[PDB]
Ligand binder design. Sequence first.
Ligand code: HEC
Ligand code: HEC
Ligand code: HEC
Ligand code: HEC
Ligand code: HEC
Ligand code: HEC
Ligand code: HEC
Ligand code: HEC
Ligand code: HEC
Ligand code: HEC
Ligand code: HEC
Ligand code: HEC
Ligand code: HEC
Ligand code: HEC
Lengths: 202, 202, 202, 202, 202, 202, 202
Amino acid sequence: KHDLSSGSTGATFKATNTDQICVFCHTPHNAQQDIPLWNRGNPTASTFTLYSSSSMNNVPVKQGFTADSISLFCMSCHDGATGLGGAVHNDPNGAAIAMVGGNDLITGEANLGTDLSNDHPVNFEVTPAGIAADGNLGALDTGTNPPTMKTGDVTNGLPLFKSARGATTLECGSCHKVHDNTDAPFLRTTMAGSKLCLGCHK
Amino acid sequence: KHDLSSGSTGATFKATNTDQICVFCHTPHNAQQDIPLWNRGNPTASTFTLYSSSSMNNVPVKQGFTADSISLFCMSCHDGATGLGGAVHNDPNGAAIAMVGGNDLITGEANLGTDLSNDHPVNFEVTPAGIAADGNLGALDTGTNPPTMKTGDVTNGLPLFKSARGATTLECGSCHKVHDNTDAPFLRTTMAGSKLCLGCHK
Amino acid sequence: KHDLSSGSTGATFKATNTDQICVFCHTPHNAQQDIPLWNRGNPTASTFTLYSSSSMNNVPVKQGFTADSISLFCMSCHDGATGLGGAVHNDPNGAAIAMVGGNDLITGEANLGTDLSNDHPVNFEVTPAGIAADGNLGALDTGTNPPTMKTGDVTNGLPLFKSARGATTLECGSCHKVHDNTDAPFLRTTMAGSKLCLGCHK
Amino acid sequence: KHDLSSGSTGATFKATNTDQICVFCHTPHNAQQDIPLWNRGNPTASTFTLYSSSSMNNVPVKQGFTADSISLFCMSCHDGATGLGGAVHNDPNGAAIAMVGGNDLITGEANLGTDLSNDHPVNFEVTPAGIAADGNLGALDTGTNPPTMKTGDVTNGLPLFKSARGATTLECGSCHKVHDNTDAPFLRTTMAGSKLCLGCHK
Amino acid sequence: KHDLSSGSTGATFKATNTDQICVFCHTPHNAQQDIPLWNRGNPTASTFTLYSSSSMNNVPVKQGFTADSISLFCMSCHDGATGLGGAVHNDPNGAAIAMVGGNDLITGEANLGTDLSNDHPVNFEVTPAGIAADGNLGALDTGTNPPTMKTGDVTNGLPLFKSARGATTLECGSCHKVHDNTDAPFLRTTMAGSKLCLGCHK
Amino acid sequence: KHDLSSGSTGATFKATNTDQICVFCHTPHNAQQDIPLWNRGNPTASTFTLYSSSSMNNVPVKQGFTADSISLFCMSCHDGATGLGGAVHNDPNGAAIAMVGGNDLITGEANLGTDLSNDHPVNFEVTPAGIAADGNLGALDTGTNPPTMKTGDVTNGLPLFKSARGATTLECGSCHKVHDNTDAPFLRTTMAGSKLCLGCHK
Amino acid sequence: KHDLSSGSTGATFKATNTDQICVFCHTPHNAQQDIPLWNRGNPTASTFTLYSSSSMNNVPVKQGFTADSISLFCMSCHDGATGLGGAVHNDPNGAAIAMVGGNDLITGEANLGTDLSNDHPVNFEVTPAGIAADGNLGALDTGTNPPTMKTGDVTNGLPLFKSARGATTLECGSCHKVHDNTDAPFLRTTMAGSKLCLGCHK
Ligand code: HEC
Ligand code: HEC
Ligand code: HEC
Ligand code: HEC
Ligand code: HEC
Ligand code: HEC
Ligand code: HEC
Ligand code: HEC
Ligand code: HEC
Ligand code: HEC
Ligand code: HEC
Ligand code: HEC
Ligand code: HEC
Ligand code: HEC
């Protein structure tokens, strides 16, 4: 899916003036941030809302992302308003990347918009006190890099990410693995059987 | 019972084109409401009647549910008219969920229909004035989330739910716990001994 | 007395395959009538006769009960012909309730049979004209729910019930309170001293 | 006088194991006859003789009472041979009623025995032909319930009772009112002045 | 005259502790004899003599009355030796009847004493043979109750009474009617004109 | 003649305050003597003389009557000195009997006075020896009551009376019958023809 | 002859308004003298002369009768001047006795007139001295009542009468017996044979 090459066969949206996989994401030189080789323009965090209800631990952090949130990286192409090709910084041929059909914005069901009223919670620090209060959020392992949240049925658990809210924070990349399409839509494991879901919500 | 997986052993009705527990109830993205990850189509409240007699406190609210009533969520599959698989919004494989035998409607004794003339009252605000008038509806605790109605014989009491009629409202989920089948048919405690019944009707 | 649990200590007749107080009387769902949660099979009213003499106001109504008479509910187990356990509708374990000794019918002095030639009158509308004609049937209060017949010596009087013959009708429950055994055999007050009798027959 | 309660102050004979006025006469359930709530054992009529002389209209009926005579009810405790407490049918506490001193039989002047050679005539049908023959037995009124024998000096006359000999029959209750002690020994009017006697024997 | 009530106006002797006409003569219960409701003490017959001369039919019966003679009843208060109030058996208030002035014995001209040497003959059987022998004692009628002695000038004749000497016996009540004072001193007809005397002595 | 009623038509002397025949002679109660019901005051016998001559049998008895002589009864009103109305003992209305004209004494030819020098002999015992001596005084019959003196021409003879002088004594009533006026002046038979005179003086 | 009844057959003079023998001579009451029952008017004795000659003993008594002479009684109707019916005192019917023909005076040979110059001597005392002087006047008997003069040939002699001249006096009745007509004209014995005459004049 994320093979945006012109010669790709399974890509819904692909360029027409380049053949490279990685220019859409990674540039060897002249990148944006010291988070691996990011060459994509990201929006502001002030225009994003998250899931909030009186059953969680994220009440004060229900508005806005952080400046170092990977969820920002994902929504940079998964917001429905940022150009797929027009947001590049280090373009591959000195000009704007040509897009097929002229639709430089993601559409369809994959579009997420700007409101997360219908999405799984992201960018909040899972805490051992919160886990004890709920009593069902598995366990924590700190000896691994990155630290993972222990599960009673899945090997290696789910990776966690460091953010402003804390060093053990759930994120857009917790479930989705961008590069590996072994279990589409790039889930960390094949979802049939609910075994990934049972990893956390036991 | 509510394990609608194809590989389930104790489910009366199960799908044949999926293996996931939660797609029938919860979808990670593109949900219906900001009430936890609801992916089920609910009917209108105008076609529902409730228990009403000259011994209660719910005389003006004996017709119709609210738009935010959990009882609506439960009757969405427990009405006897809404499709068990056809009412999903975010389907798991891009098509309608296949049902065994083709009976996409609940039948048997578990069917409740649309008339509650033979059911325990639901969706009404229990009030301290009403409790004092009756003199037997236990007591109230507001320091817990959700607020519970105190009982003289059962630990932790019964949870209450917030609705349009009020913040302390009895509901379909007051007695039934959807996920925990420790005491089937998903009662909050084992019913033998009438100890749950004695919790309120002392 | 009416604690029909298997673990009960003072019950003459008790079940052996259940432990619940209320299944014998009340079922949460799938009840019989919109009169509180009735799960007991009642007989026909055409086979019942009542007390009749040329000193009362019930001459035309000396034969048969009404379809909404609480006396029917009481005689449903107090007729001497209806099964104590076999008349349930919503059984607690999917089968007929097991009875100790196999005697599913009430016996002894408590048995009332089908003829009320030796019983206090029931199911007739007490009227202010009739009270004035007799001149001793206390007085009437309509501001209370249910309306009561005023007594000159007892606080709160006797409750009355609504029926087909009228809205102020004496009934089996007028003297007997089914749940409260403070004054056995479930009388509304302790009978020693004839103070209950003096409440009406002054 | 007829207040046989243990706490009574003016009763010659009173019980010691009960406090109720009416168990001695009336039981709510399980009575003897369809004549109001009779719970007292009555003797046979074959052992009773009546006043008979060649000046009356009761020559063929001078021996024995009827099975439905109220005089039998009165003599059930006013015969001098039937137990005051031992003749109850529906006892108040599951055992024989305890009597003070052990004298369960009425004694003294109030005792009447079994021979009415010294008593006013009872249980005979007064007839208009007989009244015309004597010419002094007042008049008859049939529009009242029960029918009364008209008197020229007393309001409302004397009530009459229905029996086997006829529908207008003098009886033990014609002069004596069991419940009202306004004019002791329970006469229908105060006897001073002979006005009751002048009501009939003008 | 015989109205012995305390409120009487024409009575020479009256009581002061009662107001009843009939207690002096009749008691409803506990009477003396089976001759109508007699409550007066009578003297012995051995102390009485009668009119005797060689012109009548009563030679062998000139000494003593019978045990069933009404003349005994009359002399019970008309002997001059028996107490007017002290001879009662069933007293009206549990004590001796109080008499005005303390003179409980009849005095004056009305007093008759114990010797009938100056009185009209009583208590002897008038016989048809005796009537034929005298030839002036009217005639006899047996079809009436009581049998009367026919007179040629007076309607209905004189009533006769049954006694030991015979069934057609003259008696104290033959001329005197105790209750009817239409013709004082309680004669059966007004005596002016000798028409009563001419009824027998033609 | 002897009908002294006020309404009488043939009576020379009659009362004005009474209507009774017999009060002048007979009173039912309180009479004077045991000689039938005498209510008239009689004079003394010492003031009476009789017929005496040397041809009879009454020489020693020619002065004075006896205390039991009927002639005394007759002269009680036939002496000319005793009051006709003032000599009553048992008066009919509590007062002296009123007489017409005020003449309470008999006058005229019927007056006899106190001397019998001009009258037929009375009050002497006729004896069989005396009859044999005279040889004309009929015969004697003792089997009749009263004994009569036999006559050869008149049926039933003349009645005789008992007195102190003897049991067969002539008397004022021998010829005169007081009640029967068939042959006035109350003779025992019609005197025309001298047949009564020939009965004795043959 | 002396049967003066109206129905008489042998009487020359008889009444027409009466039928009685004795009213002409004897009245029961109201007579004239104490000489037996005389009811006839007698004349004076001064107008009568008697037989007188110088051969007797009656020289000084030859003029006039005595006031007590029976000869006066006889001449009262045998004088020829006194009325036969008009001289009665006690008349039988309140009026003068009617006489046949109107001749109330005796006539014919039986008339004696007023002069006894032709009659046998009367009313003089026969004396024993006079009898001795004459020597033929029988003898005297004093033991009989009345005293008689003894005769030598006739049984019982002649009765004598008492008068003023003496106790043994001849009289009109000496020979004549007024009542007995055995030997007419009422002689004491049949005169044929002169045996009566020979009784005295021997
Ligand atoms: C972080 C902000 C994100 C973003 C941008 C997306 N996800 Fe998820 N996702 C999860 C599961 C189980 C599915 C399968 C969908 C299904 O079974 O119906 C998905 C799918 C997607 C899609 C495409 C399919 C779709 O239905 O939209 C997209 C574009 C997408 N995701 C974006 C699970 C998780 C999860 C843990 C349960 C987390 C955290 C996220 N997703 C986070 C994100
Ligand atoms: C809210 C609208 C609901 C719905 C949809 C159901 N219930 Fe209840 N329930 C209660 C108890 C004690 C039982 C046991 C039944 C028994 O003992 O016989 C049940 C059972 C059910 C069933 C299945 C079994 C059946 O008999 O129908 C179903 C499908 C069901 N429930 C649906 C008690 C309560 C209660 C408090 C007393 C409340 C509130 C509810 N239930 C509410 C609901
Ligand atoms: C309505 C049809 C009923 C029924 C089914 C029963 N009752 Fe009554 N009850 C009353 C009183 C004073 C007693 C005490 C008995 C006593 O003192 O001896 C009772 C008792 C009973 C019993 C059990 C004991 C018994 O003696 O039978 C039963 C089974 C019973 N009742 C059934 C009084 C009343 C009353 C007002 C006076 C009325 C109405 C009823 N009862 C009605 C009924
Ligand atoms: C029907 C069989 C009965 C019975 C059992 C009794 N009575 Fe009478 N009663 C009447 C009157 C006027 C009195 C007063 C007594 C008085 O004045 O002296 C009574 C009294 C009694 C008593 C108690 C007192 C006593 O003297 O015995 C008793 C126990 C009693 N009664 C029993 C009048 C009548 C009457 C109409 C005149 C009739 C009918 C009855 N009584 C009937 C009965
Ligand atoms: C039966 C033993 C009796 C008794 C006790 C009494 N009588 Fe008579 N009575 C009769 C008449 C005609 C009178 C009127 C009196 C009169 O006219 O003077 C009476 C009166 C009385 C009285 C009171 C008045 C008085 O003079 O004493 C009394 C107390 C009395 N009686 C008592 C007639 C008869 C009669 C038939 C002729 C008979 C029988 C009786 N009486 C009997 C009795
Ligand atoms: C007893 C002492 C008496 C009394 C008081 C009276 N009598 Fe006589 N009597 C007799 C006869 C034949 C008559 C008729 C008179 C006549 O024919 O003229 C009478 C009449 C009377 C009267 C009234 C008429 C009169 O002439 O005086 C009276 C008042 C009277 N009597 C009173 C006959 C007898 C007789 C037998 C011959 C005897 C005895 C008596 N009487 C006795 C008495
Ligand atoms: C006394 C004064 C008298 C009276 C009035 C009468 N007598 Fe005599 N009498 C006597 C005898 C023997 C005869 C028979 C005459 C004869 O035989 O012829 C009579 C008759 C009469 C009559 C009628 C006949 C007549 O011849 O007149 C009358 C009227 C009469 N008497 C009147 C005898 C005596 C005698 C003794 C001898 C005495 C005395 C009397 N009589 C006296 C009287
Ligand atoms: C859009 C998404 C792309 C595309 C089209 C490519 N890459 Fe990647 N890549 C992407 C992200 C968001 C990250 C970092 C994720 C994280 O830090 O959690 C990366 C990272 C890499 C890395 C180093 C990290 C590792 O190896 O685990 C490499 C070597 C890499 N990417 C290679 C790569 C190549 C060869 C591509 C085309 C042939 C290519 N990427 C495309 C996001 C995206
Ligand atoms: C139908 C009912 C289902 C089924 C088949 C599953 N879930 Fe649940 N779930 C359901 C409801 C009505 C609710 C909310 C109830 C309320 O708000 O009172 C939930 C909630 C959850 C949650 C979060 C709430 C909590 O944990 O207390 C989780 C983590 C969850 N559900 C998980 C889950 C999984 C893992 C399932 C398959 C393995 C699954 N659900 C099925 C209703 C239903
Ligand atoms: C047979 C009788 C039973 C038994 C064994 C139980 N209940 Fe009751 N109950 C019964 C009747 C006939 C009625 C209605 C009476 C009327 O309407 O007049 C009820 C009512 C109730 C109620 C609500 C009415 C109220 O509270 O006043 C409750 C809460 C209730 N019953 C509870 C209850 C429980 C907890 C029992 C076992 C622990 C139980 N009942 C048994 C009749 C009968
Ligand atoms: C012995 C007598 C008693 C006693 C101790 C009580 N009652 Fe009565 N009662 C009795 C009789 C013989 C009758 C019927 C008489 C008839 O039918 O002529 C009654 C009747 C009643 C009635 C209904 C008739 C009415 O009201 O007129 C009542 C309501 C009643 N009795 C009440 C009552 C009470 C309350 C008593 C004790 C507090 C009581 N009775 C005692 C005889 C006798
Ligand atoms: C003394 C005498 C009294 C008095 C003061 C009263 N009564 Fe009478 N009564 C009396 C006698 C001797 C008799 C019987 C006479 C007989 O048998 O010949 C009676 C009879 C009655 C009767 C029934 C006989 C009838 O009616 O013919 C009655 C109804 C009656 N008595 C009534 C009565 C009343 C009402 C009195 C006071 C108001 C009363 N009596 C006084 C004697 C005497
Ligand atoms: C004055 C004389 C009178 C009057 C006015 C009445 N009677 Fe008589 N009565 C009288 C006497 C002297 C005697 C007795 C005579 C004797 O013993 O020889 C009587 C007797 C009676 C008798 C009974 C004797 C019988 O019947 O033979 C009766 C019944 C009688 N009397 C009745 C009576 C009546 C009814 C009178 C008025 C209607 C009446 N008498 C008046 C004297 C006198
Ligand atoms: C005229 C003479 C008469 C008549 C018509 C009658 N009697 Fe006589 N009677 C007469 C006299 C003068 C005397 C007395 C004579 C004397 O005393 O000597 C008498 C006497 C009697 C007597 C009594 C004397 C006796 O019996 O001896 C009687 C009983 C008598 N009379 C009866 C009587 C009768 C019955 C008459 C009519 C039937 C009658 N008398 C007529 C004179 C005269």
